[PDB]
């Protein structure tokens, strides 16, 4: 909360929570953390929303939807999310944000509800929340070390089996910046690499680095822990900046 | 040729060229270039030696087989890239050479030559050459802008349907190093993606980076103009050295 107007604001019909960090308009990053569906690592998301807090981004964190509030998860983490973008764009402009420069970054889990907040934006999300698919739009999306659980899953009943974000890549799909670690042998990088094959099948811009970066754990706790920069950052700030 | 000794030496049974830049040992760098089998570029060649030079690397550039001495060109670069690793192995001691950080760096054109090498050089490289795989080793291998071109192929005859470097990748495969362009509409990095993917599915180390670069043409001539530093050049040098 570093010399910034610090602000939490519970969402409709929801239990997550927002917090947002508050420095013309200027771009807004909404992390997406962490933490397996059964908590929300409050310390990496702040840290997370610091990173760009700290490079002209007002920077949000969401506390979404989680198992222990409802069980099957579903998709109401996706949705958490929807109700996040739309809330920053009806509150634009007394938060000094341009409407047209939202960011989600997605890491480990929430990369999974990033990802497929950019195939369902503008279709599923905006049918179940029944609001206009333009209040909605993911202007880019950045993923940072996701990773896949079938926690996430069964209006709107989709099982882990069509819950496979590169399998729904459509053209409402953003532009979208990944990085993740080649060299976790529990979770190979097959999965991110498939979605980015899609991406570039349906020509969807994006951009991909893979990392020798350590198991994903480690990976996202140097993340959090050591930016102050890494390389990941650097990339991803250049991208952002570089498409506007 | 920046106080460096310069030497030249032409390749044994091959009209291939091997031009090196020479400073315990240390690693060496062989600059597999474009120049899209009718030409080499060599001012990009030698750009993308002292690229390497500079970080502590004896430099050598490959003038490999191209159209006009041999129609087909069949594997004629990719046995001339073996020649070169062969010869620096064997004078190592003489031009301060470990002989144990040996790595091909491929480009355009050349990065295909070097992804054929690495799944080759055990195999069809040693028997064609009649010399020990283990001379031919290449301890690491980079791949930048990579791209394919149906001139490469036809003792040891294969068409181009046959040199997918992605579906000859075996556990002889060693670590690569891989960065392209994401946003050249006329080259996708779809195949480069795919590489990866079988680097990934047989466990061979790697790291890849699809940067929004531009045209693969631009994006080679400002890595060889522009370098003096990039962060493709950071972020290989990086991992060549944590792989030590």
Redesign the interface.
Same mark, same amino acid.
């Given at each position: 909360f570093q010399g910034m107007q610090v602000i939490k604001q519970k969402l409709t019909a929801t239990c997550a929570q927002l917090t947002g960090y508050l420095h013309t308009n200027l771009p807004a990053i909404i992390i997406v953390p962490g933490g397996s569906y059964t908590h929300i690592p409050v310390a990496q998301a702040e840290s997370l929303a610091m990173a760009f807090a700290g490079h002209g981004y007002q920077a949000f964190y969401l506390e979404y939807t989680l198992l222990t509030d409802q069980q099957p998860l579903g998709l109401a983490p996706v949705l958490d999310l929807g109700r996040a973008v739309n809330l920053l764009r009806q509150h634009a402009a007394e938060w000094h944000i341009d409407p047209q420069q939202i960011t989600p970054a997605g890491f480990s889990v929430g990369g999974h509800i990033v990802a497929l907040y950019n195939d369902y934006w503008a279709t599923r999300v905006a049918t179940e929340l029944n609001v206009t698919p333009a209040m909605l739009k993911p202007n880019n999306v950045v993923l940072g070390y996701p990773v896949i659980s079938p926690l996430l899953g069964f209006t709107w009943t989709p099982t882990p089996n069509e819950l496979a974000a590169d399998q729904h890549v459509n053209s409402d799909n953003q532009p979208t910046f990944i990085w993740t670690t !080649? *060299?976790d042998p529990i979770v190979?990088?097959?999965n991110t690499? !498939?979605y !980015?094959?899609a991406l !570039?099948?349906a020509?969807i811009?994006?951009?991909?680095?893979?990392?020798?970066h350590g198991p994903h754990g480690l990976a996202l706790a140097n993340a959090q822990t050591a930016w102050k920069v890494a390389?990941w950052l650097?990339?991803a700030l250049e991208?952002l900046a *570089?498409?506007r």
């Open positions: !080649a *060299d190979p990088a097959t690499l !498939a !980015a094959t !570039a099948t020509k811009p994006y951009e991909l680095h893979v990392f020798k390389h650097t990339l991208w *570089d498409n």
